[PDB]
Design an enzyme around this catalytic site. Structure first.
Site, PDB file in Angstrom:
ATOM      1  N   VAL E  58       2.175  -2.929  -4.860  1.00  0.00           N
ATOM      2  CA  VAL E  58       3.172  -2.252  -5.708  1.00  0.00           C
ATOM      3  C   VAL E  58       3.361  -0.785  -5.293  1.00  0.00           C
ATOM      4  CG1 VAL E  58       3.901  -1.709  -8.037  1.00  0.00           C
ATOM      5  CG2 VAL E  58       2.754  -3.818  -7.566  1.00  0.00           C
ATOM      6  N   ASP E  59       2.271  -0.061  -5.053  1.00  0.00           N
ATOM      7  CA  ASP E  59       2.356   1.287  -4.469  1.00  0.00           C
ATOM      8  C   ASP E  59       3.042   1.362  -3.104  1.00  0.00           C
ATOM      9  OD1 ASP E  59      -0.700   3.070  -5.451  1.00  0.00           O
ATOM     10  OD2 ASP E  59       0.995   2.251  -6.593  1.00  0.00           O
ATOM     11  N   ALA E  60       2.963   0.347  -2.255  1.00  0.00           N
ATOM     12  CA  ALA E  60       3.329   0.553  -0.848  1.00  0.00           C
ATOM     13  C   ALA E  60       4.780   1.029  -0.611  1.00  0.00           C
ATOM     14  CB  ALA E  60       3.092  -0.751  -0.097  1.00  0.00           C
TER      15      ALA E  60
END
Lengths: 266, 47, 77, 50, 77, 77, 77, 77, 77, 77, 77, 77, 77
Positions: E58-60
């Site tokens: 999700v962060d990437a």
């Protein structure tokens, strides 16, 4: 006194500064362009609140008796037990640093935020009229440089704990092989975990700065724009809400520091 | 707002207060608290 | 003058979108904390510590945007 | 803008905030401290009597 | 002149949309963590481990967008 | 000329919206993975294998948009 | 001036909105696949073949928009 | 001149998007409070205490956007 | 020349908005098909038949939006 | 001149976004009240009293936005 | 030039937003129909008749928005 | 002159966004009433009374935005 | 004159936002009606009576917005 209210609001957002090229006082109509212009007012209130925290806690720490405690001793042992309970739940290693680091962060950030509750003109009036200083604002955490200095302190500790616990093996692996595992993704992994690492301190500092700067800016606007008989009705609800914010933003700086050092070390 | 030499000046202040709190404040307060918790736990050991 | 008005409209995009993102993200997460606290009230301190851990992630990215919006208005002006 | 008026309005707003803070905020803090002194007094009395 | 000004507006839309994406995505994922932890409190270290694996994905993409927003403001300005 | 900065704005819209789609799509999908892992903690390797199959499809269209955003910013503009 | 920069902005709107639509549509559908798989672990091949039937339809209409956005950048502009 | 009316528009975008973020975030959070209050009606004060703790976090980011919106509208010019 | 160059932007808006509508609509509808297939696995060919009936209705408005977008690019511009 | 026409546009966007936020926020909060009442109608006066507490906070930020919208339209004109 | 362009843009925004409304509204309604069909499959011809009644209302207001979009492109030109 | 172009557009934004807010808010609140009426018939007049209380609050802000949009079209333009 | 094309654009946004609001509002309300009918199929005329009452409220604001947008398009332009 010639104040248009936009100008009063402008002057209230100006700091007091020392020009280290000359040791002059940077008068707030022409700012020198140098990076050597130390903010005196956030520095003075930061160290004086840090000294007051250490004087109160050392006074009890030197006396403290394991009988039935005194009423002041009981207040200080309540905050020691709250910090140790938080650390002991979130962190499980042997380190002697994490618990006192979490105490200084919680009590010092709380004290710095607590300066914001006081009337916005009272200390700047005393500094303008009695001391004769060209400006003052008295909330340290509202100024960027103190919150980034604490967030970079925690960044240097995040690197120290990740290298010491796992060094030539572990830090190179977590920077290169995560999240996508296969060696074909290493350049992408290095960018994503690089920005993830850099996001932890920059968000710690900007979180605390942004909440205290907008908190002070509302008291400057409510004091600036509204006539005296009408300030109290908007001001009292903002002060009551801000008591919740000063304790939450002090607690979150403590919790995220423990969580980031615990996740780095373990 | 302007990033400034205060960032260094605060970094010296923070590390001095963390070293004083670590040695002087935390060990004597936690020794006094844990000394009472042990004396209550031995008070349960009498039962 | 002309350069400054567009700079105040750039900050208004950063801070408006980050205020929507951070408020609704913490509202979804906090609603699940309050549900778990109603199901097993004796877990409420444990679930509180897990909430503050996850909430630091949720509003980490929005705080970069809020901080640069404050930089654009007060420093770039 | 009258500067002395802004000082008057800030004084009224601080007194109303202090009256809220004393009644709502201070009784919870003093009750938590006295609850600790009660729990330690009971704990030391029980420990020393046992 | 206008090139420099519009580059601050262009970074503002990158960082606003990265803030909404990251905060809503982690808020939905973290809410399902904090409700699994309340229903199954013995499993928290397992569910916490799987949460940190999934949250890295999700962060990437938001980290690509926010890192390029910082590049557009500071480097090409 | 203005054009070189409406290429930065075009890439900014394209890459920001791709970060909304990638982060919320994996947020929803990952939340339902964690709910399944909370119910069936001996099935975590099976559910994590299926999650990587469907997560590759969620990423596939946003990864095209982010790649073309990098092309417009670096190679064209 | 205007011809090329408006064609890149049009392609950015097509691929940005196709990335929103394709990623959230497959995220929702994949969430119901992963809960079905956790509920019926003997039926992952049956539910994944149904998921690929549905996923073809979900992706097909965004793929018109992505392919035509690539035509706008590479062959009109 | 054009300066003032575009500053009033930028304030309107900060204030509107802050009203979206605060109202939807507290609406979601408050809905989960009310179903917890219906589930455990002796624990309404305990659940209301935790509701005010997380409501402070939800309101905090929109109040940054409100404070700066009032500064742009009233105080900058 | 700006009249035709903006017609490519008009088609980009019309089919992009139709692609988010169609992909999320079929994503939600298909999610309820997969949940039904997991609850009653001997029932899948009947539920798939009903999914194709209602999927034709969901697509009918987006498909005329996409068709008029293609007409605007190819036949008008 | 244009100043008044843009001030009506600014008041309109600020009050439109406040109307979306306030109406959907109370719609979500009230939906969870009505289902908690339907399960056990002996709690209707208790849940309605908590509903009015939470609904006050939901209204509080959108009413700042409406109060400033009315000020822009009537007093800045 | 620009008058005829802006008429095609007005039809693009009118049919794009109508395509979102029609596809999302029928996607939600059809999902709840499919869950009713999976729970009681002998009830499908009754539930399908009620679905066609409710769907006619959902679809009717987007269909006047589409019909006016085709009037703007084909008749106003 | 220009005044009418911008005043009809300002009303159109104000009343369009109010039509989103009112229709989604009453759609969510009404759906929770209809599940309550299916769960407990013979409580329909009591649940309908609570639904009309909550509906008055949901309508209150959108009705301000409608009334001011009618003022902007009929009295200002 | 520019006044004509801006009046068609103002009608297009007013009716597009009304068609989104009314179609999704009746889609949510109808979905809860169809699961109520699937649970209690001997009550369908009673639940139809309540559904048509609530549907009148959902439509009332969007039908004002459509009526005024259609007036702007036909009578004012």
């Amino acid at each position: 006194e010639n104040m248009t209210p936009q100008d009063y609001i402008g002057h209230h957002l100006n700091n007091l500064q020392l020009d280290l090229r000359t040791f002059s006082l940077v008068d707030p109509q022409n700012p020198p362009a140098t990076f050597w212009t130390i903010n005196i007012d956030s520095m003075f209130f930061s160290v004086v609140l840090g000294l007051l925290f250490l004087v109160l806690f050392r006074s009890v720490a030197k006396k403290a008796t394991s009988g039935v405690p005194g009423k002041f001793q009981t207040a200080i042992e309540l905050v020691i037990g709250f910090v140790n309970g938080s650390v002991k739940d979130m962190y499980h290693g042997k380190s002697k640093l994490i618990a006192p680091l979490a105490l200084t962060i919680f009590v010092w950030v709380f004290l710095m935020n607590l300066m914001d509750l006081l009337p916005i003109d009272l200390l700047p009036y005393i500094a303008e009229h009695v001391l004769g200083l060209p400006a003052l604002r008295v909330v340290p955490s509202a100024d960027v440089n103190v919150t980034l200095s604490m967030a970079l302190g925690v960044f240097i500790l995040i690197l120290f704990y990740s290298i010491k616990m796992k060094g030539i093996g572990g830090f190179t692996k977590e920077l290169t092989l995560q999240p996508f595992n296969h060696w074909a993704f290493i350049p992408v992994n290095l960018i994503l975990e690089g920005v993830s690492l850099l996001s932890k301190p920059v968000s710690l500092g900007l979180r605390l700065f942004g909440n205290m700067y907008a908190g002070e800016l509302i008291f400057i606007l409510i004091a600036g724009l509204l006539p005296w008989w009408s300030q109290w009705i908007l001001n009292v609800p903002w002060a009551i809400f801000h008591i919740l914010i000063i304790t939450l933003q002090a607690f979150i700086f403590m919790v995220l520091t423990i969580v980031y050092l615990s996740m780095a070390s373990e | 707002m302007n990033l400034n030499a205060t960032i260094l000046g605060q970094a010296i202040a923070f590390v001095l207060f963390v070293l004083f709190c670590m040695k002087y404040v935390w060990p004597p307060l936690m020794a006094a608290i844990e000394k009472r918790q042990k004396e209550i736990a031995d008070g349960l050991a009498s039962a | 003058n002309l350069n400054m008005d567009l700079l105040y409209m750039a900050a208004a995009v950063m801070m408006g979108l980050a205020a929507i993102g951070a408020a609704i993200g913490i509202g979804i997460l906090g609603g699940k904390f309050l549900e778990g606290a109603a199901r097993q009230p004796d877990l409420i301190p444990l679930l509180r510590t897990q909430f503050f851990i996850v909430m630091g992630l949720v509003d980490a990215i929005p705080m970069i945007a809020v901080g640069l919006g404050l930089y654009v208005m007060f420093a770039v002006a």
